[PDB]
Design an enzyme around this catalytic site. Structure first.
Site, short mmCIF file in Angstrom:
data_model
loop_
_atom_site.label_atom_id
_atom_site.label_comp_id
_atom_site.label_asym_id
_atom_site.label_seq_id
_atom_site.Cartn_x
_atom_site.Cartn_y
_atom_site.Cartn_z
N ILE A 135 0.81 -1.20 0.00
CA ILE A 135 0.00 0.00 0.00
C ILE A 135 0.86 1.28 0.00
CG2 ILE A 135 -1.75 1.23 1.26
CD1 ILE A 135 -2.38 -1.39 2.73
N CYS A 136 0.58 2.21 -0.91
CA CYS A 136 1.23 3.53 -0.88
C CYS A 136 0.37 4.55 -0.18
CB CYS A 136 1.55 3.98 -2.32
SG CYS A 136 2.34 5.60 -2.33
N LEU A 137 0.72 4.94 1.05
CA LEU A 137 -0.15 5.78 1.83
C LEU A 137 0.73 6.52 2.82
CD1 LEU A 137 -2.81 6.62 2.93
CD2 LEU A 137 -2.95 4.56 4.32
#
Length: 156
Positions: free
Chosen positions: A87-89
């Site tokens: 996840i890119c967050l």
């Protein structure tokens, strides 16, 4: 890890057990407070609606000074999430680029991921082609996102 980390985790497992954010649940996989799993319900009025999304939630040795390490176990079709569930967050990364701070917690990051599912950041993609589809061909994005949800996030 430390006693202060142990003590904080006991308190968070308590809150996750008793006041989980709507649409979210998080639990200890077995007997270790730092090997957790979570589940996020696909949100209504999103292509993920009615899907059930499982995630692995690993609490690093230096928590809460490093963020939880979280990935999707259930495949999901999204600009900011890769085919291995990475996840890119921002809140899953430390400053300066990230936003993790010890005043955040397991529940708030799972809520941020739930919000990311409703509100992708196509500007900072992990999946370039999905991200382009989202930006320029929304109806095709929504259709592919529903179909992936039907295929992988609905055992029924």
């Amino acid at each position: 890890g430390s006693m202060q980390r142990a003590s904080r985790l006991k308190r968070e497992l308590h809150m996750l057990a008793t006041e989980p954010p709507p649409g979210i649940t998080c639990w200890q996989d077995k007997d270790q407070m730092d090997d957790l799993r979570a589940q996020i319900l696909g949100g209504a009025n999103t292509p993920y609606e009615k899907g059930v999304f499982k995630l692995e939630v690993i609490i690093p040795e230096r928590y809460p000074f490093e963020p939880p390490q979280i990935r999707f176990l259930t495949p999901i079709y999204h600009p900011n999430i890769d085919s291995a569930g990475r996840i890119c967050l921002d809140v899953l990364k430390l400053p300066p680029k990230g936003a993790w701070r010890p005043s955040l917690n397991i529940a708030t990051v799972l809520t941020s991921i739930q919000l990311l599912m409703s509100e992708p950041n196509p500007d900072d993609p992990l999946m370039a082609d999905i991200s382009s589809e989202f930006k320029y061909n929304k109806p095709a994005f929504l259709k592919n996102a529903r179909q992936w949800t039907e295929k992988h996030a609905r055992q029924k």
